[PDB]
């Protein structure tokens, strides 16, 4: 798509495409380029963008997010804001597009030695992810794919972290009707194999516990530099049995995995809590957050320093 192309969203706002970063910078045709706080995401009418679109339209509403933030006394919530969407024509083909808040670099790009982060940063990231999970879960959605590549630093505030890429997102409780539990080995082992939940491995529709579980595996990976199933990633059944063994052997499976300079006591207890959840059970988000911050230290800046590496 050429820079300068004007897109018309369903609301009737007009947007001018900037340079590619497909994701492009976007400007409103009303304001000046100096004030560029938007990106446009473009795909054909052929899947994951439409999956993201249903999520962002239903959940990433500025005013509700604002009121939630005020009520729950959050400094922020790591959900990128949605501005509009629609279709544009390129030749004969139609493309779907979505205008979102511009964000910064992903965490996989900025990770230290062996995809690790400092323990305080790992624990803060999980707390920030728990705030997002509570919000999306309350709005009937699970993410399914938490990982460093899908965590992004802000643009307007580069010190805030966001959960992005709702391509594998799932509406688990449409209009209050929680999905039933059904194993389906024809739909087995979707997600990022390293981090995907046991329910995903079994072909079971994703529910709230799966996101908490995935977040636990992520924190473990970020802190320790590897997961026990690191050598088995091309064998999803081996990965499934490894994660099952890890959860069955809690807390020691996780406690013992940690290096001497970064305890896994918090992540061990987090996963003990996660593993106690029934399929349709609401996570106790407040308890999980206190588990990650057992001394109630106020959240500082995210430390991505690679001093010494
Ligand atoms: Mg299959």
Residue numbers in the entry: 15 to 35, 42 to 66, 68 to 330
The authors write:
VRK3 is a pseudokinase member of the vaccinia related kinase (VRK) family, which also includes two active vertebrate paralogs (VRK1 and VRK2), one or two orthologs in all metazoans, and an ortholog in most poxviruses, including the founding member, vaccinia virus B1R (Boyle and Traktman, 2004; Manning et al., 2002a, 2002b; Nezu et al., 1997; Nichols and Traktman, 2004; Vega et al., 2003). The VRK family is part of the CK1 kinase group, which displays distinctive alterations to some motifs conserved in almost all other kinases, but still assumes the standard kinase fold. We present here the crystal structure of the VRK3 kinase domain, the first solved pseudokinase, along with that of its active paralog, VRK2.
VRK2 also phosphorylates p53 and BAF (Blanco et al., 2006; Nichols et al., 2006). VRK2 has two splice forms that localize either to the nucleus and cytoplasm or to the ER and mitochondria (Blanco et al., 2006). VRK2 is also well structured, except for the ATP-binding glycine-rich loop (G-loop, G36-G41) and N67 in the loop linking β3 to αC. The unstructured G-loop is commonly seen in kinase structures without bound ATP. In contrast, the VRK3 G-loop is well ordered, with low B-values that indicate that it is rigid in the absence of ATP. Both kinase structures are in an active conformation: the two lobes of the kinase domain are closed, αC is rotated inwards, and a key ion pair between K72-E91PKA is formed. The overall structures of VRK3 and VRK2 are similar and superimpose with an RMSD of 2.3 Å, using 291 main-chain positions. In the C-terminal lobe, two helices are shortened in VRK2 relative to VRK3 and CK1: αD is truncated, containing only a half a helical turn, and αI is shortened and loses its distinctive kink. In VRK2, residues 206–208 form a short 3-10 helix, with the charged R207 facing out to the solvent, opening a groove through the middle of the activation loop that might participate in substrate binding. T213 is found in most serine/threonine kinases, anchoring the loop and organizing the active site via hydrogen bonds to D166 and K168VRK2 in the hrDxkxxN catalytic loop motif (Nolen et al., 2004). T217VRK2 forms a hydrogen bond to the backbone of N211VRK2 to help stabilize the position of the activation segment, and thus its loss in VRK3 may reflect the change in conformation of this segment.
